[PDB]
């Protein structure tokens, strides 16, 4: 029995293309205060982000269509994503410890997964 859970989630940056289609992009973000960063907090089942299969809760969004968002405000990230067109190219990086600061009663387990009590 070879569980995925027991193997580390890659920590290096990745490139993900989402296809907006006829809905939103299917995820929510938190953060954006004073350069703390923009993090994915929720991925909607069946939505474009989910259909991509390459994003997760705890990913920081480093850029949208080449536009740097590491230090962007929440409103700025939202605007950029809204305007990024049909084909949205995201650079993302999994940062669960940093993400876990934002979600109440959450922490990172020894496998690097985000847990919430």
From Swiss-Prot:
It comes from the Eukaryota. Palmitoylated. Palmitoylation is required for targeting to postsynaptic density, plasma membrane and synapses. Palmitoylation by ZDHHC2 occurs when the synaptic activity decreases and induces DLG4 synaptic clustering. Palmitoylation by ZDHHC15 regulates trafficking to the postsynaptic density and function in synaptogenesis. Palmitoylation may play a role in glutamate receptor GRIA1 synapse clustering. Depalmitoylated by ABHD17A and ABHD17B and to a lesser extent by ABHD17C, ABHD12, ABHD13, LYPLA1 and LYPLA2. Residues 15-95 form the PDZ domain. Expressed in brain (at protein level). Detected in juxtaparanodal zones in the central nervous system and at nerve terminal plexuses of basket cells in the cerebellum. Expressed in cerebrum. Expressed in hippocampal neurons (at protein level). Isoform 1 and isoform 2: highly expressed in cerebellum, cortex, hippocampus, and corpus striatum. It is found in: Cell membrane; Postsynaptic density; Synapse; Cytoplasm. Transmembrane segments: none annotated. Interacts through its PDZ domains with ANO2 and NETO1. Interacts with KCNJ4. Interacts through its first two PDZ domains with GRIN2A, GRIN2B, GRIN2C and GRIN2D. Interacts with ERBB4. Interacts with KCNA1, KCNA2, KCNA3 and KCNA4. Interacts with LRRC4 and LRRC4B. Interacts with SYNGAP1. Interacts with ASIC3. Interacts with SEMA4C. Interacts with CXADR. Interacts with KCND2. Interacts (via first PDZ domain) with CRIPT. Interacts through its first PDZ domain with GRIK2 and KCNA4. Interacts through its second PDZ domain with the PDZ domain of NOS1 or the C-terminus of CAPON. Postsynaptic scaffolding protein that plays a critical role in synaptogenesis and synaptic plasticity by providing a platform for the postsynaptic clustering of crucial synaptic proteins. Interacts with the cytoplasmic tail of NMDA receptor subunits and shaker-type potassium channels. Required for synaptic plasticity associated with NMDA receptor signaling. Overexpression or depletion of DLG4 changes the ratio of excitatory to inhibitory synapses in hippocampal neurons. May reduce the amplitude of ASIC3 acid-evoked currents by retaining the channel intracellularly. Belongs to the MAGUK family. The PDZ domain 3 mediates interaction with ADR1B. The L27 domain near the N-terminus of isoform 2 is required for HGS/HRS-dependent targeting to postsynaptic density. This is Disks large homolog 4. It comes from Rattus norvegicus. The chain holds residues 302 to 402 of 724 of the full protein.
């Amino acid at each position: 029995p070879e569980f995925l859970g027991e193997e580390d989630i890659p920590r290096e940056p990745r490139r993900i293309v989402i296809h907006r289609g006829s809905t939103g992009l299917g995820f929510n973000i938190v953060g954006g205060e004073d350069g703390e960063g923009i993090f994915i907090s929720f991925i909607l089942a069946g939505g474009p982000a989910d259909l991509s299969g390459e994003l997760r809760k705890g990913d920081q969004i480093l850029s949208v269509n080449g536009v740097d968002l590491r230090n962007a405000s929440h409103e700025q990230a939202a605007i950029a994503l809204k305007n990024a067109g049909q084909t949205v190219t995201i650079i993302a990086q999994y940062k669960p410890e940093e993400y876990s600061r934002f979600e109440a009663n959450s922490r990172v387990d020894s496998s690097g997964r985000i847990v919430t009590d």
